[PDB]
Amino acid sequence: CRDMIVLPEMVGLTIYVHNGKEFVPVEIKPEMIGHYLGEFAPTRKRVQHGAPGIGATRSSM
Amino acid sequence: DEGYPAEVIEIIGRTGTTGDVTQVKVRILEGRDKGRVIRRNVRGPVRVGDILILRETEREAREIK
Amino acid sequence: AKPLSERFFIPHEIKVMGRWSTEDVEVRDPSLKPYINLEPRLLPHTHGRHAKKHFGKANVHIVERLINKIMRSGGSHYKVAGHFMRREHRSLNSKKVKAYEVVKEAFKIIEKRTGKNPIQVLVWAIENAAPREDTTSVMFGGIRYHVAVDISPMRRLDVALRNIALGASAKCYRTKMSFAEALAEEIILAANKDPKSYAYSKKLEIERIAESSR
Amino acid sequence: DFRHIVRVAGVDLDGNKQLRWALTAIKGVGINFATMVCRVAGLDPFMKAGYLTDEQVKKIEEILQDPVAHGIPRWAVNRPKDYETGRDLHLITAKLDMAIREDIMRLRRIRAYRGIRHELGLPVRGQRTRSNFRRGQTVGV
Amino acid sequence: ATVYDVPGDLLVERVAQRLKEIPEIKPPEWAPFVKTGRHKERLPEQEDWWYYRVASILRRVYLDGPVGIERLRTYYGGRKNRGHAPERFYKAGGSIIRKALQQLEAAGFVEKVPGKGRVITPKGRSFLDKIATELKKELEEIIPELKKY
Amino acid sequence: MRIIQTTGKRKTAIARAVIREGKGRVRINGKPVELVEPEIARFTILEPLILAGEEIWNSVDIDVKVQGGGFMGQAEAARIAIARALVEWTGDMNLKEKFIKYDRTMLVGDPRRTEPHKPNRSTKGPRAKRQKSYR
Amino acid sequence: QKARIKLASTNVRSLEEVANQIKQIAERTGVRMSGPIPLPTKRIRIVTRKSPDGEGSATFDRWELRIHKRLIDIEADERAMRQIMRIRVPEDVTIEIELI
RNA sequence: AGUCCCUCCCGCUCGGGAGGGAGGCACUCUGGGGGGACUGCCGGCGAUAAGCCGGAGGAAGGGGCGGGCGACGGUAGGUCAGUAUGCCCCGAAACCCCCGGGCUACACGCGCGCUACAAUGGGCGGGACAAUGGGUGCCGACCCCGAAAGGGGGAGGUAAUCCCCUAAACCCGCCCUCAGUUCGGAUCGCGGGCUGCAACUCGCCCGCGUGAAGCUGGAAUCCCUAGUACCCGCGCGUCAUCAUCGCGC
Ligand SMILES: [Mg+2]
Ligand SMILES: [Mg+2]
Ligand SMILES: [Mg+2]
Ligand SMILES: [Mg+2]
Ligand SMILES: [Mg+2]
Ligand SMILES: [Mg+2]
Ligand SMILES: [Mg+2]
Ligand SMILES: [Mg+2]
Ligand SMILES: [Mg+2]
Ligand SMILES: [Mg+2]
């Protein structure tokens, strides 16, 4: 359930939220009240770019 | 200085690289050569009875077919 | 602001915009005489019925021709005084009421500054700004050359009107002057053969280049 | 009488402008809010800012301290329903800057999605990034 | 002389001046802080814009009645600038129009026709036509062709 | 107790005019013609009346109802209707030739209408098209 | 005491045939008839892309279906009402009868 | 529209307006049928033919104007991922359901656009005039509440009847006076709403605040011949919600 809203009675527990391929731990802190759980479980990996390949510019085609 | 008026009396045909020029025959109305008939190249639309202002009246265009 | 006698103005005679008569206006140039139309007419708006027929623009009142000429953007695909002038959404394209107002205010300014009939001053301007010799281009050896030719009266009139409008357009662009003031300034300067006018300078340059290639 | 520089709430105000537009130099005050405070103070929004007297400046600053208590509606302030106190506040100058910084810092402490986006310098409100938002140098192939 | 014989804007100005003597027209408490529609950008600049809006609404009811809130909301809308998106038409809000119509009824100038809208009572018709006659008398001194009408 | 009715059309604007004996009052949709705005529209309506002359002008009353079109389209339809009414009421042939010398369209109308749009940028016009690219 | 008759069809000829039958029935007796009134035609226009795939220039079809209408008002008389109830329409004409 | 009855207004009413009712089909409109234009008339050129050029009259003049309809074939052009279908494969997974992710990532190259770089303007108040289409899982007038977005009731409408539906550019008055500005409105903070089973990834709307690049564009290159191009808004498709698009006005 990524659309569950964090409530005060949930403070102090640790929940494992599905991100698409695995469950990640989230430690609920008081300043999280009012947010969806999914905000703490990213679903994409950060992008580190490589070298542009063939066809990346006009001259390489 | 102020040119010489001439009057169009005949249309001969189109010419130029892109067909933008017409050859005509004019009759001088003023000056030393009043009454003479010579042919000229004109740019722009023209019809019989128009009046041109020539800066000189001793140059004549080469005849076209 | 504008007095109510001007907001609700009613004419009673056929005269240009109900304010100026064109009876005493005469044209000096013998070639342009049968192409400057001066028949009596109240409203200079003919709704574009002349574009269909050949030579049909000959019988269109000269004030309406000026109004049509200034109803534009100005510098779309060639540079005027060193700049493109692309106004787009803030231009005068298809807004003929505003152009009418601009021409009216310019005529009032002209009458105030010089004391003469504004149509007469306009005629003088177009007489002084109409070139008499032009040039055509030929290509040889990958190089372009000029050859001098003559100009028909209709093309003379068209070029003069376009150059006057372009000069006025350039003078008010991103400066504190207004469009009506620039138009008045341009017409007055052209009527006095002042080189500071865009149209007169253009005519001089065209004729000089044509002469240097006979 | 006329002063070319008048100091209000720690910002110098041009004395030649109309009061409503002179007031906008303060960070946290736009044109609409300025007109509201001019009307509440009972001053003509079209008067020159240079004719303000000392008591009028004091009154303007008093209003800017707590607009709600002087009759300005609660839906007009720039921080209604404060996250800590729960009240309706209006912040200007440094206080505004540090409040915004604290909001972003709170988002970053809990490792929320928007906090990560703030850290990486990427769009936060759901924009596409394949075509636009390019600030850099062309790479060679 | 009737309302049909004089320019609209001039009549609205005179009527707005005249409406300041009627005790039942008082701008509400939230008047200082509002825009007149979501398509606007800044607040009104006249310190007495309420009277202008009321005079315009009264003249509107005189000419097109019976008429309700929604159609007037259409009339007072306009074009909006939307940043990088193309401009679009939007309607105005409803509170100003509703409060103005209620005050006009309280002053006895309009009345309610059930299921149809609001119409001008004889008192309001006389009120507008008197000002129209006076304005026309003033105006024809400089436009002599207006004496025939 | 003569009454004459005439009709004018101009690009979706339709005008119906009624002419009768009177003192010289002309109204457009109930408004005096002297207060029509802007000025360029007021002069469009007044041209036939000025051409006819003051003697004929002051001896008739005209009421015109016009609908459709725009502010410039509505003025021209009214002008056509008024010209036709004037020539029919007085029935003099010197005036009819005078109208034709000044402006033929006053009496024969204008048949132009919009051209329907076509695909490839259909919303802009029948002939305007999208910018073409090759690479 | 008067009856209102509505007709509609996609074929203009059948509509006229049924209307003429009604007019003859009314004339064949002493009865007043409000003539067949032509009401505005319904046009259903549907525009579709032609190609099954998305390659090539985009071209379109404009299909159209037209529905014509008539309106007849006649006073209810038993001698004539039965006759107009005994007339049977072609399969492509819709007829409805009501009492006003 | 003319004629008649009643009511209400103004300069007090000779005169001039606005509603309603009787009444009419005149005018507009709607839509069936018919007329009208044929190089027919006139003068030239060409051959004396085919035709061309220029005039009258005319609503219209020389395919009258704008559309539909694309020959025998080729392109081993696109489509088996709309449907039809041969062969080859998978056939307890390559078939059938459910939950959560993705197609929305981001040093960078390119196409088509929208908003601008201001006075041929920006703002505030006031005044004008459309057409095409669509509506029962829907269009909703009219009244009430709210600053707004919106909320609560709800006539009429299966529609030439009721509704969407009192467009914008334009005109009049006042403020700003050539400035990164009262030009521009990207980015971000806080708060309030709607649709939906669900709004974080990843929706649309409103209020206050914030205030980036941009001062007219190199070499190159696109569209358009008349109610056309430019400028300005609107309807339908898609659609529970969402239009910088498509087709039309
Ligand atoms: Mg408005
Ligand atoms: Mg803009
Ligand atoms: Mg179009
Ligand atoms: Mg193939
Ligand atoms: Mg192939
Ligand atoms: Mg995709
Ligand atoms: Mg701005
Ligand atoms: Mg989100
Ligand atoms: Mg600048
Ligand atoms: Mg699409």
Swiss-Prot record, chain A:
Protein S19 forms a complex with S13 that binds strongly to the 16S ribosomal RNA. Belongs to the universal ribosomal protein uS19 family. This is Small ribosomal subunit protein uS19. It comes from Pyrococcus abyssi (strain GE5 / Orsay). The chain holds residues 67 to 127 of 132 of the full protein.
UniProtKB/Swiss-Prot annotation, chain E:
Transmembrane segments: none annotated. SMART domains: Ribosomal_S19e. GO terms for cellular component: cytosolic small ribosomal subunit. PROSITE patterns: RIBOSOMAL_S19E. Keywords: Ribonucleoprotein, Ribosomal protein. SUPFAM superfamilies: Winged helix' DNA-binding domain. The keyword Acyltransferase does not apply. GO terms for biological process: ribosomal small subunit assembly; translation. PANTHER family: 40S RIBOSOMAL PROTEIN S19. HAMAP family: Ribosomal_eS19. Part of the 30S ribosomal subunit. May be involved in maturation of the 30S ribosomal subunit. This is Small ribosomal subunit protein eS19. The gene is rps19e.
Curated annotation (Swiss-Prot), chain F:
Residues 108-135 are annotated as: Disordered. Coiled coil: none annotated. Belongs to the universal ribosomal protein uS9 family. Residues 119-135 have a biased composition (Basic residues). One of its GO terms (biological process) is maturation of SSU-rRNA from tricistronic rRNA transcript (SSU-rRNA, 5.8S rRNA, LSU-rRNA). The lineage of its organism: Archaea, Methanobacteriati, Methanobacteriota, Thermococci, Thermococcales. One of its GO terms (cellular component) is cytosolic small ribosomal subunit. It comes from Pyrococcus abyssi (strain GE5 / Orsay). Keywords: Ribonucleoprotein, Ribosomal protein. Pfam families: Ribosomal_S9. The keyword Endoplasmic reticulum does not apply. The keyword Hydrolase does not apply. This is Small ribosomal subunit protein uS9. It comes from the Archaea. GO terms for molecular function: RNA binding; structural constituent of ribosome. InterPro entries: Ribosomal_Su5_D2-typ_SF (IPR020568), Ribosomal_uS9 (IPR000754), Ribosomal_uS9_archaeal (IPR019958), Ribosomal_uS9_CS (IPR020574), Ribsml_uS5_D2-typ_fold_subgr (IPR014721). NCBIfam families: PRK00474.1 (NF001749), uS9_arch (TIGR03627). Residues 108-118 have a biased composition (Basic and acidic residues).
Swiss-Prot record, chain G:
Disulfide bonds: none annotated. The gene is rps10. This is Small ribosomal subunit protein uS10. It holds the Pfam family Ribosomal_S10. Involved in the binding of tRNA to the ribosomes. One of its GO terms (molecular function) is tRNA binding. It comes from the Archaea. Part of the 30S ribosomal subunit. It comes from Pyrococcus abyssi (strain GE5 / Orsay). Belongs to the universal ribosomal protein uS10 family. InterPro entries: Ribosomal_uS10, Ribosomal_uS10_CS, Ribosomal_uS10_dom, Ribosomal_uS10_dom_sf, Ribosomal_uS10_euk/arc. Keywords: Ribonucleoprotein, Ribosomal protein. The keyword Lipid metabolism does not apply. One of its GO terms (cellular component) is small ribosomal subunit. One of its GO terms (biological process) is translation. SUPFAM superfamilies: Ribosomal protein S10.
